[PDB]
RNA sequence: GAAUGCCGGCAUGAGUAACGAUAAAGAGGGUGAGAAUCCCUCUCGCCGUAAGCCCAAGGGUUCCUACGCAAUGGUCGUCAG
RNA sequence: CGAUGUCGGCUCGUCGCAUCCUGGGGCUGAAGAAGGUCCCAAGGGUUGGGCUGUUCGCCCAUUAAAGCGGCACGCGAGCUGGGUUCAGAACGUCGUGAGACAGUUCGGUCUCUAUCCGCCACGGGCGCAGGAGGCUUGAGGGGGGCUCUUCCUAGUACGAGAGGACCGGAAGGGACGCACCUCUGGUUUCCCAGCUGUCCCUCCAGGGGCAUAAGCUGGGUAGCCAUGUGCGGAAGGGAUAACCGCUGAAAGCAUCUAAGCGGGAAGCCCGCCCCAAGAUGAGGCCUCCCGGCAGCCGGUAAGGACCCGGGAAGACCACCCGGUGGAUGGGCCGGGGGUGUAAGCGCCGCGAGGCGUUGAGCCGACCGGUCCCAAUCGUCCGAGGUCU
C-alpha cells in the first residue's frame, strides 16, 4: 500500500536511493499502489554522480511492499521494505541491476526486464 | 443439524494427512508449485516458521527467510494443493506460539533465542529408524 | 480577463460580504495585475486598468 | 424461474484448479410444496415451499389444516418462490448444478440502532483542531429559511441491518445432494443459521 | 448549542394526549397452588413459603 | 452490539466484578444459601460451580486453583471435606436461583435466592 | 387587558435535566410499623507529607447522654452536625 | 436596530443547465486518427497536493473530465474561529495633542437539557362488520444509474508517409454501493503466559490485592470490523430528443408532413434491488372457530396476551425461539480455539537456574452432547357475526 508521501528504497543501480510517491498512476484516483504499479516520484537521496540525481521527477514501478500482498492460491507475500525500480516510459528500468528479490506479479504486468534482471523472484 | 460437522464435511474432500509435524521455531523447506512462463516449477522457501495459525482446515502458518539483503515472509495455507511437500531441516526450541520478534534482531541474536530443540531433534532420529 | 473577489484586510461586513477586488489579466502575454486599494470594484476595475495600461506600455518599451 | 428454501450454515474455502474459492454453505433441500398460486385461483403463479420440520405439538390447528390439505407433514416455514412450479411435489438442490449462477435472499445482520458513521458512511468531524463534541456527528441537514425544512429520505442515525438482502449473480460452486448442501461462491446476507432463499440469478 | 426552549405553554389537552400512555398495568398474580394467596408466578411463595410443592423458605 | 458476547458487566469496572463474585461465592460456600439481585444471583451459579467441581476433583492443584478465588484456608477446607462430597455423583448442576416475590424497598430491586442443591 | 408594569397565587417545560468528583462494593445477623441507606460481624476497595494526628483563626453548644422523625438531609432513615 | 451572527474552512447535501466528461447528432477549411463549432441531453461522475485566513488565483502530478451557478455568496440552537469587527502592544503614516488609518503586525471568553413544524428510526390505539393462524398481490414510493485501459477484428479501411479506424467481440482496472468474516489484517477490560515494586495469605514453595477507570509487557477465540472476500451499474423491451429518412400533396417540380409510416441518446417508461393495503380505494388466497336481559351483561371456542428461559432481535417497545409431552439459558462432558510444557515430585548445578514427568496445565463467547440447575404452578382476554 503504496500512497502520496511514503518513501520507497530504489532496488536498482541508477544512483537514486529513496524516492517519495507523488502520484500513484492508476485512473483518475486510485488510493494505493501495490506490486507492480507505477508511480511518480521525487528523488530525495541519490548517491554522487548518478543517472538520477536529487530533485528530479521520475516514474518506478512498485517490486516490493511492506503490506503483504495476496495470490489467487490462497498464499501471501510480504517484504521487509518498500522498494521500486526507476523506468522510462516504455516501462524499462533505466538502471542495469536490479537488487533484492521482487515480487512475481512483476511478470504478469510486463515487467520482463526487471523480473529476469532480479536475483530472486518470489 | 450439527454446521460444524457439515463445514468439516465439505472440507473433507480437501484436508490433507501427508504433511510432517513442525512448530513455530523450526526452520522449514516448503516445496511450493508455481506458474511463470510458459510453465509451471517447484520453488523451494526455507525459513523460520514465525506462526501458525489454527482453525482446523483453515490453519495457515507463516514462514520468514532473508532473501539477499530483505526479509520475505510468506503465508500458506497447510492444506494447500500447491505444497509439494515440506522438509524439517532444523527444530528450534522457542518459548512462544508467536515470533514477530525475530523481525527486530540480527541473525546473531535470532540464533541465540531459538536454540537447537535437542529434545526434538532426538525424536526425529529416533524416528526415521524404518523397518 | 478579469477576476473579481474580496479584499484581504480591514473593512467589516464590508470587504468580507462584498466582491470588491479586481484582477486584470491580458491572456496572450500572462501579465497579471490587481487593485485593492478602495472600497468600489469600480474605483479598482478602474485603477487596475491604469496599471495593465501601463505595464503593456513598460513591454512594448521594453521591446 | 427455480428457487428453494435454505438456512445459512458457515463458511469455508475450497481449492478448484490452483485457487482458493471462498463459499457460502447452505443447507437447502427437501422442500416440500404445500400449495401452488395459480392465475385460476390466485391471479398469479408461485409455488409456496415448506422448509424443517416442526414438532407438531407446536402447530395450531389452522395451520394444520392447511398442511393437511397438502398430504404433507408440519414444517417450520412457509415460503413462496415466484413463477416457479416445479414437476413434481419436492424441491431439492438438484434443481441447480455447479457452474450456474444464483440469488441469495437472507436477512442482514441487524446493528440496532446505528450512528451516521456506521449507516451511512458518513465522515463524521475532527478528532482535534478544536472539533467540539461532534466527532461522529452528521453536520447540516438542511439550508436555512428556503425551503426551511429536511428532505424525506434524509440519512440519519436509525436502525440498520435486520432487513431482507438480496445478493446477486453468485456461482454455484458445488451441490451435495445426499447433504442437501449448496456450495455458492461468495458472501451471503445473515448470520450462520439464518433463513435463506436460493434463486436463479435475473442477470443475464 | 443555544439553549432550546419551548415556544409555547402546552395546552392542557396535548399534555394529557401525551400521558395517554402512562396507566399502570396492573401485577400479574397467581394462586399460590399451597395456601391459595395471590402472588406473582415464578417466584416463591411470600405467604406459606413453598414453591415446586414443596418448603423453600422461612415465612 | 453484543452479538454472541457472554457474561454481564453489573456497572463495575473489571477487578470490582471479580471481587464481587469471589465475595459471593465466599458468602455461599459459608451460609450455603443467599439473597441477591436477580442478575447477580443468576451469574454467581456459573462460577460457584466452578469451584465447587473442582474441589470434587480434590487433587492439590485444585486446592489451589479454588484458593486463589476464596483465599481463606479453612473456607477450602470446607469446600473439599464437607461440601463436595455431597455432590460427586451430581454431575454439574450444584446450585439453584429462586426469584423472591417482593422487591426491595429502596430501589425496587428484584431479589432472588441463590443456594447449594442438596 | 396590556406599561420586558407592582404584589401574590397557580400553571407550561415534565415525571423531563438533575440528585455535586468513576475511591466500590457483597453477604450474614440484629433492631424496627417500616431497612440497599441505622447497629454488629466477615469479605472487598480507597487515603496514608493524608483523605491520619496536634495547634492558631474563625465558628459558638454543633460535645456526651436519654427519648424522637414533621420539617432540615438532593433517595431512604429506626440514623444525624 | 425590545438583535435577521458575517469571511474562509469542515460536515451534509439538494436543485438549475448557459454541459467539464461520458451518450446521440448536424456542419467542417471532416482523408484517418485527433480537433473546431453548433444542436439534443442534468443519469451518473467531476482526483490528490505546494502557497496563502483566503473565496479566487498561480503552480506540481494525474485524469474521461478536473463544469458554472442557486439554495440568507445553503448550512456557527451542526463544528471550527485562521481572516474582518472591542479592550493590550508595536511599526509606517496623519495630528501640537488626546488619538486616528478599506495600512500592517503579535495576542485575544463561540451559551450541557428541542415545546411545535420538519427529518431519521421504533412503538401504543383504533379502524379495515364475525372472530382467529399463516401466505401473499402491488396502487404508489425509495435505491441504483459512473468510467477507463488493453487485446482480437486489423496494422485492414484511409494515408505520400507518420499515423490509424467505423461496426462487432473479449479481458482487466479506478472510485462508489450492498452484504460478508473463509483468507489477509485489526480489536478482543481478564482467555493464557511472562515481569517489577509493595502489602498480605503461610516461613519455603505456591498464590491474592494494588500500581487505570487492564500495573506493565508478549500473545489471542467468538463478536464487531477494512486494509480483506463476494456481488451490483446491466442485458433486454417500449416511447421519445436533436438528427436522418420512406411515401406525399397544397404548389404539374420539389418538400421527412399537411393524411400516413420508419430510424434514433449514459436521458424517459418498464425491467433489477428495497419499502409498501391507514391503497379508509383498508385488496387476494389457504386453513381454523360456531346462555341473563344494529345495545348491553356473563361465561367460553378458534386463538391471543400475561408470567418465565432466552436470542448475531433490541435504547424501552417491538421481533424471533423455547417453556418439563423441553436442550431455552446456566452448569457439566466432548470437540474447536488461545496460551505454550501447571502444580507436585525426581534428577543435575554451590547458585540464579536447567532437565524429565509434559504439548503439560489453565482455558470467554465458537460446534455439539447431556435434564444436573433453572423456564414450577397458573391467570386473564377473546366469537354468538348491522342492514337492503
Ligand atoms: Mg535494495
Ligand atoms: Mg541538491
Ligand atoms: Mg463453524
Ligand atoms: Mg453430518
Ligand atoms: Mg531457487
Ligand atoms: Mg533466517
Ligand atoms: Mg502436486
Ligand atoms: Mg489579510
Ligand atoms: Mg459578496
Ligand atoms: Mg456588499
Ligand atoms: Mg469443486
Ligand atoms: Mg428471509
Ligand atoms: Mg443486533
Ligand atoms: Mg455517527
Ligand atoms: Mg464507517
Ligand atoms: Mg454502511
Ligand atoms: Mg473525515
Ligand atoms: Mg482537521
Ligand atoms: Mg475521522
Ligand atoms: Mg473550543
Ligand atoms: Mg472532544
Ligand atoms: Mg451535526
Ligand atoms: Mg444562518
Ligand atoms: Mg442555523
Ligand atoms: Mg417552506
Ligand atoms: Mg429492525
Ligand atoms: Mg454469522
Ligand atoms: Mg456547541
Ligand atoms: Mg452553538
Ligand atoms: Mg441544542
Ligand atoms: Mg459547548
Ligand atoms: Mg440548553
Ligand atoms: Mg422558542
Ligand atoms: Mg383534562
Ligand atoms: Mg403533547
Ligand atoms: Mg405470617
Ligand atoms: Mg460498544
Ligand atoms: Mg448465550
Ligand atoms: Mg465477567
Ligand atoms: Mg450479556
Ligand atoms: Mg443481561
Ligand atoms: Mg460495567
Ligand atoms: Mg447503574
Ligand atoms: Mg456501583
Ligand atoms: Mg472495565
Ligand atoms: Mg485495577
Ligand atoms: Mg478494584
Ligand atoms: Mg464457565
Ligand atoms: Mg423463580
Ligand atoms: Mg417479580
Ligand atoms: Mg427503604
Ligand atoms: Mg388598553
Ligand atoms: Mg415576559
Ligand atoms: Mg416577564
Ligand atoms: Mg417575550
Ligand atoms: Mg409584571
Ligand atoms: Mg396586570
Ligand atoms: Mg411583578
Ligand atoms: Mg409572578
Ligand atoms: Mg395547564
Ligand atoms: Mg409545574
Ligand atoms: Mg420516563
Ligand atoms: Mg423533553
Ligand atoms: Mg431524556
Ligand atoms: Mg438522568
Ligand atoms: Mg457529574
Ligand atoms: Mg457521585
Ligand atoms: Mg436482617
Ligand atoms: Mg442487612
Ligand atoms: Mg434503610
Ligand atoms: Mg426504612
Ligand atoms: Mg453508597
Ligand atoms: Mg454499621
Ligand atoms: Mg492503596
Ligand atoms: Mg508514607
Ligand atoms: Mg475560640
Ligand atoms: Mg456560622
Ligand atoms: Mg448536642
Ligand atoms: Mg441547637
Ligand atoms: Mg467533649
Ligand atoms: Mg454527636
Ligand atoms: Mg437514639
Ligand atoms: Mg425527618
Ligand atoms: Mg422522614
Ligand atoms: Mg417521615
Ligand atoms: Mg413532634
Ligand atoms: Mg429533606
Ligand atoms: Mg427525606
Ligand atoms: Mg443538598
Ligand atoms: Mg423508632
Ligand atoms: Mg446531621
Ligand atoms: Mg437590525
Ligand atoms: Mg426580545
Ligand atoms: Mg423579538
Ligand atoms: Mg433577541
Ligand atoms: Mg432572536
Ligand atoms: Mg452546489
Ligand atoms: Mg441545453
Ligand atoms: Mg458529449
Ligand atoms: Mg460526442
Ligand atoms: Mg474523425
Ligand atoms: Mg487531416
Ligand atoms: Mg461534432
Ligand atoms: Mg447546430
Ligand atoms: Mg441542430
Ligand atoms: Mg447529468
Ligand atoms: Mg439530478
Ligand atoms: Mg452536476
Ligand atoms: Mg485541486
Ligand atoms: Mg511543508
Ligand atoms: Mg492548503
Ligand atoms: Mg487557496
Ligand atoms: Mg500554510
Ligand atoms: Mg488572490
Ligand atoms: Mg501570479
Ligand atoms: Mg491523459
Ligand atoms: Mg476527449
Ligand atoms: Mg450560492
Ligand atoms: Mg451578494
Ligand atoms: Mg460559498
Ligand atoms: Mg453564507
Ligand atoms: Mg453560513
Ligand atoms: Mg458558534
Ligand atoms: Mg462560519
Ligand atoms: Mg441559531
Ligand atoms: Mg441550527
Ligand atoms: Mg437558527
Ligand atoms: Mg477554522
Ligand atoms: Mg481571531
Ligand atoms: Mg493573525
Ligand atoms: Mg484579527
Ligand atoms: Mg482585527
Ligand atoms: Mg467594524
Ligand atoms: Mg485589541
Ligand atoms: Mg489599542
Ligand atoms: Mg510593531
Ligand atoms: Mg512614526
Ligand atoms: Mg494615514
Ligand atoms: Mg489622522
Ligand atoms: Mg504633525
Ligand atoms: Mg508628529
Ligand atoms: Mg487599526
Ligand atoms: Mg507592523
Ligand atoms: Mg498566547
Ligand atoms: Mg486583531
Ligand atoms: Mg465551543
Ligand atoms: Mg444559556
Ligand atoms: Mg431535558
Ligand atoms: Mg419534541
Ligand atoms: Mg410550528
Ligand atoms: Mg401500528
Ligand atoms: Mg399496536
Ligand atoms: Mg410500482
Ligand atoms: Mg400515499
Ligand atoms: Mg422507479
Ligand atoms: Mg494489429
Ligand atoms: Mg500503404
Ligand atoms: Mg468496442
Ligand atoms: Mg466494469
Ligand atoms: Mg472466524
Ligand atoms: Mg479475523
Ligand atoms: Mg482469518
Ligand atoms: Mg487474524
Ligand atoms: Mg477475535
Ligand atoms: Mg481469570
Ligand atoms: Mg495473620
Ligand atoms: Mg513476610
Ligand atoms: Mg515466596
Ligand atoms: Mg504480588
Ligand atoms: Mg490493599
Ligand atoms: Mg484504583
Ligand atoms: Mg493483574
Ligand atoms: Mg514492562
Ligand atoms: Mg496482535
Ligand atoms: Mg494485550
Ligand atoms: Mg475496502
Ligand atoms: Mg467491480
Ligand atoms: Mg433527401
Ligand atoms: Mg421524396
Ligand atoms: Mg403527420
Ligand atoms: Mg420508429
Ligand atoms: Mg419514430
Ligand atoms: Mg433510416
Ligand atoms: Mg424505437
Ligand atoms: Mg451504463
Ligand atoms: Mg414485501
Ligand atoms: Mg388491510
Ligand atoms: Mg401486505
Ligand atoms: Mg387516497
Ligand atoms: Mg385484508
Ligand atoms: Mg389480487
Ligand atoms: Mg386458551
Ligand atoms: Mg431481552
Ligand atoms: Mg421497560
Ligand atoms: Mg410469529
Ligand atoms: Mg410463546
Ligand atoms: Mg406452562
Ligand atoms: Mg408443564
Ligand atoms: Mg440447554
Ligand atoms: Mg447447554
Ligand atoms: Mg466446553
Ligand atoms: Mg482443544
Ligand atoms: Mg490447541
Ligand atoms: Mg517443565
Ligand atoms: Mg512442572
Ligand atoms: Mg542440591
Ligand atoms: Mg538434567
Ligand atoms: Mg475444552
Ligand atoms: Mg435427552
Ligand atoms: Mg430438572
Ligand atoms: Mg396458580
Ligand atoms: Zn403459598
Redesign the interface.
Known sequence: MIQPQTYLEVADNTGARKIMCIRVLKGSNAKYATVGDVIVASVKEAIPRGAVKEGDVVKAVVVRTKKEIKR???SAIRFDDNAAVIINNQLEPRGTRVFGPVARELREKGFMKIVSLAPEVL | ?N??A??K???S??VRTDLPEFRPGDTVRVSY?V?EGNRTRIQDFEGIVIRIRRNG??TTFTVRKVSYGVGVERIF?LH???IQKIDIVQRGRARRAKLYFIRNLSDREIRRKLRADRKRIDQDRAAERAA | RIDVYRTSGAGGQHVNRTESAVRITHIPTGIVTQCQNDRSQHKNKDQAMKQMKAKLYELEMQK | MKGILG?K??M????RD???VP?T?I?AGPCPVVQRRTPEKDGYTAVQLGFLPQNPKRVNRPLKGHFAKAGVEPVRILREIRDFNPEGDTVTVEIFKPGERVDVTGTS?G??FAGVMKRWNFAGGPDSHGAHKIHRHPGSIGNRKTPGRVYKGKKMAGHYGAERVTVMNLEVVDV?PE?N?L?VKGAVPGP??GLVIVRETKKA | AKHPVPKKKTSKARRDARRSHHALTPPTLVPCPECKAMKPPHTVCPECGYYAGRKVLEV | ?R?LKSGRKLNRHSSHRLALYRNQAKSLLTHGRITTTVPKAKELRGFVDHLIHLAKRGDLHARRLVLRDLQDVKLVRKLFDEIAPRYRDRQGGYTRVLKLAERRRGDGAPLALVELVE
Open positions: 489467487p492460491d490462497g | 443439524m454446521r460444524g457439515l463445514i464435511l465439505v472440507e474432500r480437501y508449485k506458474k482446515f483453515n495455507p494447500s494443493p500447491l | 438456512v450454515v458457515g469455508t474455502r475450497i481449492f490452483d485457487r482458493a463459499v454453505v443447507l445482520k446493528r440496532g451435495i447433504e448442501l456450495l450462520n443459521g | 452490539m452479538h
